[PDB]
């Protein structure tokens, strides 16, 4: 039957919180997080409407090459912190090894840049998604991720019923950032419980992907819905389900 | 005479001044505060001015929903101190307390804006107002309150009448932000007086309501007025007169 | 003949030398400066550069009253010190004193603002400009003040000439702030040769003014020059003529 | 026949790289570098697109003679370091020397600003690209050097690629500081080996002049290329002869 139309996308879920246990262990080996407090989400969102801020007065500062300059950096330095952690861990800290990371992120980040085949861009999206799911997965545990998880679900919730109300009302009464974003977001909890075939919260990787079938139901309807909520719903249900086992 | 209409500013006035007392209470249990000092104000003059700026250049990143983003959180914050302080004076440091005050804030916000009944909003204008009343209140003593005041009164008479001026001339010779403002602004003292039935600063109370008996009558006539020096004149006259008594 | 027309320059020259000095008294009531380093000066120009991109942003940023706001604090802020040292050297360390400088302040700031007569203006420009010469005469001494002069006639000499032939070349082969501000300028060294009827730098006074009768002369005629070389030229000239007796 | 064009662009080659190795020597009097750690160019990076995006939000935030003060700032302070430690050395730290460093610089931006023949212009340009060259060069020592112009040659060949696709899709499918900057970059190789007739690395020099050669080969054909790869994979080459060698 159809499978493969917009079916390979929670396939991107399933890799990604693979990719980001898988990457759970070499991580440590760096030291990262940040203190299971729940002022740390705070913190988090913070900083990230911080790093929004950044990104958009660099494009109304933008930048002819500039802002592809820029993004580079970023891009390269974060290369070369994924297979930092995955050779440098592997091969250990031999000279091998960061040279196998610098050749490795040089090499990877040149191919992003020169037009791949574009479902490439799919994999690297989720490495890298995988790579801070896992991190901020290593920042601390659980009741942090699920205050941060209800927290984001509930303000997608909001903005999306209220863009609609402009849309309502305007009658008479690039996305991908936002994607492996999100695509992020309720997998940090699938990485801080397993870093708190394995864990019980194999259910919050089900409910999860049971979050997404919902999503990708209600969406594939006119007019859309939140998007996070059921999302993090779900995967805070899938894992709060991994409880009654352990 | 008449009432409801343009009487539940006043009814805002005694509300929010009585909240911001009923609110020096629990506040202490936080710190908060800040030195007798008359310097501050000064400061404080600097810190408005950055938080004006601040605001404004949010607005320049907007920003479909940015800019509702950082205000959201800016406001959203303030209300999880609200409850938080509410929490610590009630049952204290409780695990429960907390909560108490992540699940009320997330009340008021999310009903906030989900578009309620918005004779809501004149009522959480008062919560949050009776919030900065109270803590600048709590905020150190009278003395510099009132010096601060008198600074404050003439800039608007200044301003006021200076664009009143260029419009007589010019022939040939979101408001709440400043409203709510302006109706904790006498509160302060109102609150840095209890803070130094109740004290006999009972009569600054007053002296405001009728700083907007003078404002709201004159103003309720074509062509309008200062506006700052009718309140806290007659406030810190209504006060100073509190003073002369006992 | 015609004496008082533009010839108010060099007599504001004079004055605003004079209340620079009476302005040197009661200024060390407070401290201010900064060791007479030959470094010191690109402070100067560094933080110059800053209020000046601050002063442009702010602008830019405008600005409902905001600007004519944030121009009031720095403006009150600046009026504040000079009455502070006025009457915190005149009414000594007491509470009085202070009370002079805010009764001062708040005065003339809110006269400046409420539209005065604005001969007013020369005045309180006479004030405020020999504050700011003799704080900044007060910062370090002789060599580094007769090196910084010299670079600021170069930039005006430079600029000036620069968009001159930008004028030649045209066809076929507020400015108050650089007023006042240019005026103090040369007082600078008048000022820090004092500290280094009265001392023999008045020569850098009168030598100064002669600077000026260079100036004012070149001005009042078609096809500018630079402006401050013949003004700090004129001054160090006056100064380095003040070395003969001391 | 065909001399002084575009063959005087290896003579600025050969002249730069030589100044900047004859400036080799006297320079480390001041500290300088920033440790031969591979973690420099990742920093580096970082900060000199720092410094664009600050230049840039200057332009932007012109300022008439702003920005063309601001970078007056750099010209006049970079000159004065040049003659400063020319100074520095010869009558060393005497009142003759930085006399001379002040005047020297003074001499060399008043004129490059008052519209010189503009060879000159090569040659200052000369002058401070020999400066940055050894400055960066004498910061440590090559195996970083190897891995930043890797980089380098990389994003160069990358956006130009980018942009020329970008060029041949749009149908139907003030120069000078890239300039004697990327004039500088192999030349910081040909120091960082002299702080590490001479060396065995004379030889990156010629590779460099041959890496120049190809350059001013292709470009100067119709359809121009990279740019920075041809310079530094043949002073890289020309060196890694020079280590054969020796």
Same mark, same amino acid.
């Given at each position: 039957?159809?499978?493969?139309?917009?079916?390979?996308?929670?396939?991107?879920?399933?890799?990604?919180?693979?990719?980001?246990?898988?990457?759970?262990?070499?991580?440590?080996?760096?030291?990262?997080?940040?203190?299971?407090?729940?002022?740390?989400?705070?913190?988090?969102? $913070?900083?990230?409407?911080?790093?929004?801020?950044?990104?958009?007065?660099?494009?109304?500062? /933008? &930048?002819?090459?500039?802002?592809?300059?820029?993004?580079?950096?970023?891009?390269?330095?974060?290369?070369?912190?994924?297979?930092?952690?995955?050779?440098?861990?592997?091969?250990?800290?031999?000279?091998?090894?960061?040279?196998?990371?610098?050749?490795?992120?040089?090499?990877?980040?040149?191919?992003?840049?020169?037009?791949?085949?574009?479902? #490439?861009?799919?994999?690297? /999206?989720?490495?890298?998604?995988?790579?801070?799911?896992?991190?901020?997965?290593?920042?601390?545990?659980?009741?942090?991720?699920?205050?941060?998880?209800?927290?984001?679900? #509930?303000?997608?919730?909001?903005?999306?019923?209220?863009?609609?109300?402009?849309?309502?009302?305007?009658?008479?009464?690039?996305?991908?950032?936002? /994607?492996?974003?999100?695509?992020?977001?309720?997998?940090?909890?699938?990485?801080?419980?397993?870093?708190?075939?394995?864990?019980?919260?194999?259910?919050?990787?089900?409910?999860?992907?049971?979050?997404?079938?919902?999503?990708?139901?209600? #969406?594939?309807?006119?007019?859309?819905?939140? $998007?996070?909520?059921?999302?993090?719903?779900?995967?805070?249900? &899938?894992?709060?389900? &991994?409880?009654?086992?352990?």
């Amino acid at each position: 039957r159809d499978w493969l139309p917009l079916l390979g996308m929670p396939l991107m879920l399933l890799f990604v919180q693979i990719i980001a246990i898988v990457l759970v262990m070499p991580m440590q080996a760096a030291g990262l997080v940040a203190p299971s407090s729940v002022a740390n989400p705070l913190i988090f969102i $913070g900083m990230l409407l911080a790093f929004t801020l950044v990104l958009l007065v660099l494009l109304r500062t /933008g &930048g002819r090459r500039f802002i592809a300059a820029f993004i580079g950096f970023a891009l390269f330095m974060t290369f070369l912190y994924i297979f930092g952690a995955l050779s440098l861990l592997a091969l250990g800290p031999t000279t091998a090894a960061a040279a196998g990371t610098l050749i490795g992120a040089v090499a990877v980040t040149a191919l992003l840049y020169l037009y791949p085949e574009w479902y #490439v861009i799919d994999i690297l /999206g989720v490495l890298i998604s995988a790579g801070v799911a896992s991190i901020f997965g290593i920042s601390l545990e659980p009741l942090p991720v699920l205050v941060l998880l209800v927290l984001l679900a #509930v303000y997608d919730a909001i903005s999306v019923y209220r863009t609609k109300h402009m849309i309502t009302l305007a009658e008479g009464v690039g996305a991908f950032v936002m /994607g492996m974003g999100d695509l992020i977001m309720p997998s940090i909890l699938v990485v801080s419980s397993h870093v708190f075939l394995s864990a019980p919260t194999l259910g919050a990787m089900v409910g999860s992907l049971v979050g997404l079938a919902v999503l990708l139901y209600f #969406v594939n309807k006119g007019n859309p819905q939140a $998007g996070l909520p059921p999302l993090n719903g779900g995967a805070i249900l &899938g894992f709060l389900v &991994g409880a009654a086992l352990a």
